[PDB]
Amino acid sequence: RFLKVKNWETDVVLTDTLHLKSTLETGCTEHICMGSIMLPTKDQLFPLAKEFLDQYYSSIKRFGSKAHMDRLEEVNKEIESTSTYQLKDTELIYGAKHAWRNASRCVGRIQWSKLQVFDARDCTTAHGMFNYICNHVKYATNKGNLRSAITIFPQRTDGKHDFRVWNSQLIRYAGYKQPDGSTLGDPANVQFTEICIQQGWKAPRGRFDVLPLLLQANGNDPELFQIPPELVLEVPIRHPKFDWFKDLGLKWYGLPAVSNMLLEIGGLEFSACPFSGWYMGTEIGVRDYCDNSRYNILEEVAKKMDLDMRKTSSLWKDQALVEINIAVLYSFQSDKVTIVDHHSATESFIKHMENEYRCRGGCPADWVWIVPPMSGSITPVFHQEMLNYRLTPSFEYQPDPWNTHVW
Amino acid sequence: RFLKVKNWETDVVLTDTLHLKSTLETGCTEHICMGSIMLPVRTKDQLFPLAKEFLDQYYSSIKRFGSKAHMDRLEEVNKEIESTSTYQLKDTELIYGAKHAWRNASRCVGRIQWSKLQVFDARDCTTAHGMFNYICNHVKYATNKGNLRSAITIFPQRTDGKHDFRVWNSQLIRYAGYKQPDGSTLGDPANVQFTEICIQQGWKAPRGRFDVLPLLLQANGNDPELFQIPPELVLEVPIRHPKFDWFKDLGLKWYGLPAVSNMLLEIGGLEFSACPFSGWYMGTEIGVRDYCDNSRYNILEEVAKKMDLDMRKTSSLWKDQALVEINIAVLYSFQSDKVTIVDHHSATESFIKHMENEYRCRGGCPADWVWIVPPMSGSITPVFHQEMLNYRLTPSFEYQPDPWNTHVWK
Ligand code: HEM
Ligand code: HEM
Ligand SMILES: C[C@H](O)[C@H](O)[C@H]1CNc2nc(N)[nH]c(=O)c2N1
Ligand SMILES: C[C@H](O)[C@H](O)[C@H]1CNc2nc(N)[nH]c(=O)c2N1
Ligand SMILES: N=C(NCCC[C@H](N)C(=O)O)N[N+](=O)[O-]
Ligand SMILES: N=C(NCCC[C@H](N)C(=O)O)N[N+](=O)[O-]
Ligand SMILES: [Zn+2]
């Protein structure tokens, strides 16, 4: 059944058929919509594997070819024998690029095809993992000129030899609970910062302490490693008109690199697949800096702006929020570190979406996540109806490693 | 069954059971979610169960479920339906229905006020002039010299779908929109189509930037008629900025009373096609959407320019900067002219407390996240960090085709 999507700002209407190939289930029903909920075998493997291969070969204009059929046969025999199979290089690259392409929560998918894939499937140890990761961080940072990339470690086998990167991101600041009862650093990482301490990490106890990597290979216990400081590009935050901003003492890292997700390609599961691209301003400025549960810096910045914080109707929070995001962008740009603002990012996504509609006949998109956390309606995506559904290959969430590992 | 909802800013988790009483569809399937989609004559037979459901709820709420008063009413209603195909609601039921339609509106963030709603029974109305008189009284009462009071006027329910009462305006008070051969739009672009119809029907437009539109009223299914609202009844607020003295020179102003008038109210199966309702504005409705939407007044560039902001590159966030000031101004003005209004911060905080209270006393509170979260400063309002469950409960306010696309002219 054809579905239509209307942009209420331009009246442009797109027709979606791509949803017809929807695999998994959204979490919604005809009776209830859970759109805003953050998270709603051989017989199983071969079918999934087939869907993927038919998909790949169709993309390379060889659907049905002998190569297509051969490969399809080879995998079956391989699955029937090894109860699993291995992706050829080409299928891995395609799989990862397409997992990104299908990421309904990513606003920067217009860059999906320019992804650098690092095949880390030959890795066997944590040090090996550290080595691959460092090279990933270095290649991707490129001295400020960020380049998207993903490193894929060995796929899951029996589930007891899983490769995992316990960190939620390759680079994040430590969080510590203090005497007062308050929290120093990033509250979002308190638990992990603890797991690292208990493991031996000599935590510095600072506001912005770059966490160590906790790498798990072949189901073994995780090991700690310190990313070469020379490899962690950071931007000191200063304002273009408030010379007092520098006194806030804020700084953030330039490389966003989600590393706790699971990559699925043709039925196979890669539980260690850190990936990186570059920041959209609001991610840091609005969410990391201003979320009540994160660095919660709104009051401070307000004060120094000398504005009436007596009543909410003065919109002092909104006032401050804007200046703060001005500074993040300003800084990154001043130090020549790649970064994109919500206006450019969202406009780009709209274009990508239009391309995706005429070239794929659709584009899965999660409105709740696509629309920036600030100035929502003044960005194009706000007025754009979206259809959300799941397509594989995909990036999925997965239980925290510490919540299920057998030490 | 039980469905959990979590607030990622407090870790507070709520359990929903109310969704079980959900009857209608959502547009969402098990394979596809359409949460961001704007808008995805009954038989005498299908009517009784609906009436029953509604009545069982009414009586349950007044704590007389199963009583003789309850039983006889069902008997009375079923009888009436069979013999007349329809049925009339008792005043008490109508007031209960209206309050609950509001109580169930998943796109409304001001529901903490649902219980305090003034219901005006206009069911004895038979003509447009009569509807005009009724609306005038609604506007005067609700406005209350700037101290707004929520209220709704309910005109005769649908019968055969041929004698429908309709308020052609989308809001009782709204500014006209005119398209110039130039291609530009004068006034409110959103009301261009309706404006043309008014002119075609006989209205003589002042052709200005903020012309209060005339009421186009349809009674008992007859052709719509024009009426101008008594100017002394239309409260307006000129918009000025607390610190930007040039703001007042932007020539901006807006009306104080928001009153959607094109929705359909459904109570116990009964359909009320003319049910204008009003409460008070949340600042962002005017400051963000009405003033800054590209397809509305679109004042950003001008407010930006006059603020002398670097508009050479979006990354300077001049748009975001201007937007705040403009919303600063809408709020300030209303407060200065003592006209009720609430900012998005207060409004969303209150809604969270309302929502929590609703989970504890009702077992849920259907909410549309896409609509509840404000069009600016999204994540610095609690609703953003709040998971919500959207589902439909009756009584309800529904959308309905524009009268001009269905009306059989006489
Ligand atoms: C090149 C620049 C990129 C930009 C500017 C971009 C931007 C974004 C933004 C703003 C989010 C929301 C983040 C949050 O709220 O936590 C996001 C989420 C996401 N992006 Fe992208 N992205 C980019 C590259 C990538 C890459 C390289 C991949 C994969 C190969 C990817 C996969 C995803 C996924 C899986 C999510 C959702 C993660 C989650 O659920 O927490 N993105 N992206
Ligand atoms: C006391 C003042 C009230 C406030 C501050 C409030 C606020 C809001 C806001 C911000 C919206 C979204 C508007 C938009 O984006 O166009 C809305 C929607 C809604 N409200 Fe309320 N509301 C209030 C009173 C009422 C009343 C009295 C009723 C009904 C009796 C009601 C029924 C609804 C409905 C049905 C919608 C959705 C309308 C649509 O789909 O366009 N509200 N409300
Ligand atoms: C409860 C709600 O789902 C939650 O706050 C979502 C909303 N939208 C979001 N959007 C993005 N990009 N990132 C997030 O973490 C969230 N959080
Ligand atoms: C396409 C999208 O559904 C649309 O822009 C919605 C988003 N949220 C909204 N929220 C409110 N309150 N009002 C609106 O008009 C909208 N528009
Ligand atoms: N932009 C990206 N964001 C991933 C999550 C980062 C998180 N919001 C934060 O630290 O703010 N990914 N990427 O570009 O690969
Ligand atoms: N607040 C209310 N809003 C109704 C819609 C008004 C519209 N967004 C606008 O004119 O901006 N309802 N109410 O209070 O009854
Ligand atoms: Zn849904």
Curated annotation (Swiss-Prot), chain B:
Produces nitric oxide (NO) which is a messenger molecule with diverse functions throughout the body. In the brain and peripheral nervous system, NO displays many properties of a neurotransmitter. Inhibitory transmitter for non-adrenergic and non-cholinergic nerves in the colorectum. Probably has nitrosylase activity and mediates cysteine S-nitrosylation of cytoplasmic target proteins such SRR. Inhibitory transmitter for non-adrenergic and non-cholinergic nerves in the colorectum. This is Nitric oxide synthase 1. Belongs to the NOS family. Ubiquitinated; mediated by STUB1/CHIP in the presence of Hsp70 and Hsp40 (in vitro). It comes from Rattus norvegicus. The PDZ domain participates in protein-protein interaction, and is responsible for targeting nNos to synaptic membranes. Mediates interaction with VAC14. The gene is Nos1. L-arginine binds at Q171, W280, Y281, E285. It comes from the Eukaryota.
